[PDB]
């Protein structure tokens, strides 16, 4: 990839699946190489090892590098030294969590536990950033009330909290999407949603213009128009 960047002059797209194994390899040789074991048995050189690897994956004045790296997380515990070291190197991170995948919602991205440098209004425009902010706030409020829900049921909340929870449970499902690759696994045709349609759809959902629809209409569909179409299809 570096030769294509620096010699051919082309912009290059680099996929690394999954980079975590690299660090794990360092662990395997660590004991036989005679290092004292680091935390939870990793090799001492973990930080600079991943540095020497991944500081090479960068855009330069000679060419652009777009790269996607996926990291296995041992025991799904993000605090493990390897993913914890990896967080420092990524411009954008989107954690996948068993919490949502076990509920069967795919691609099961965690909408709270993810970040990107380009989030600010200086890039996406205020009308996009505001929708992002309110989506995150709504989901977080639902999560914060979910503990009480267990003990007092959905009927216990005030009207404001109950309506917020309804919005949140609608939104959480509306984030689901049938991937074109995933047809094999789901029997659902693939849907690709352009960015503007996405921002418009979530703004519409927050503004109450699509409040009345049952939850099932939002699940595994792309774009509000197809949400309406599925609402009619389920009503039949």
């Amino acid at each position: 990839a570096e030769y294509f960047r620096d010699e051919e002059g082309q912009d290059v797209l680099l996929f690394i699946d999954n980079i975590f194994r690299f660090t794990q390899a360092g662990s395997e040789v660590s004991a036989l190489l005679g290092r004292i074991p680091s935390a939870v048995g990793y090799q001492p050189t973990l930080a600079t090892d991943m540095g020497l690897l991944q500081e090479r994956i960068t855009t330069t004045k000679k060419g652009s590098v777009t790269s996607v790296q996926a990291v296995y997380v041992p025991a799904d515990d993000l605090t493990d030294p390897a993913p914890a070291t990896t967080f420092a190197h990524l411009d954008a991170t989107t954690v996948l969590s068993r919490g949502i995948s076990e509920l069967g919602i795919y691609p099961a991205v965690d909408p709270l536990d993810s970040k990107s440098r380009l989030l600010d209004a200086a890039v996406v425009g205020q009308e996009h950033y505001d929708v992002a902010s309110k989506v995150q706030e709504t989901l977080q409020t639902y999560k914060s009330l979910q503990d009480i829900i267990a003990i007092l049921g959905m009927d216990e909340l005030s009207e404001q909290d109950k309506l917020t929870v309804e919005r949140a449970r609608k939104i959480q499902r509306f984030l689901s999407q049938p991937f074109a690759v995933a047809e094999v696994f789901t029997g659902i045709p693939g849907k690709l949603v352009r960015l503007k349609d996405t921002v418009a759809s979530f703004k519409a959902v927050l503004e109450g213009k699509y409040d009345n629809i049952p939850e099932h209409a939002f699940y595994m569909v792309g774009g509000i128009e197809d949400v309406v179409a599925k609402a009619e299809k389920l009503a039949a």
Partner: protein, 128 residues
Amino acid sequence: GEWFRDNGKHALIVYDDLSKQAVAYRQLSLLLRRPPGREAYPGDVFYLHSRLLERAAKLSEKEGSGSLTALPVIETQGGDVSAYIPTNVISITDGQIFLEAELFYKGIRPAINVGLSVSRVGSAAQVK
């Protein structure tokens, strides 16, 4: 920074972040085969961070009234505020601004957790 301090100017130094410095020292010391300590950190990391921290001061008028201010950053993992490095640095520092992810996602930004945060200099530093 000490040049600005000792010549009567005022400078603020930010470390982003000291935990990775401690990790580098852990690597270096382990490859020198020094004995490990808690959590496989080396046995004198406190003597490391303290030597950096103690250099912050406001000098008396005997030495031109200069000052060096420090604002170190710590990346706690999984909220383990009791971990070795966080514990040492908390023991060393005058006050702590704690940032909570829950408040950050709740839309309260820049998400300072007021209840946990502490400042010892307090009222003497604020404008009247």
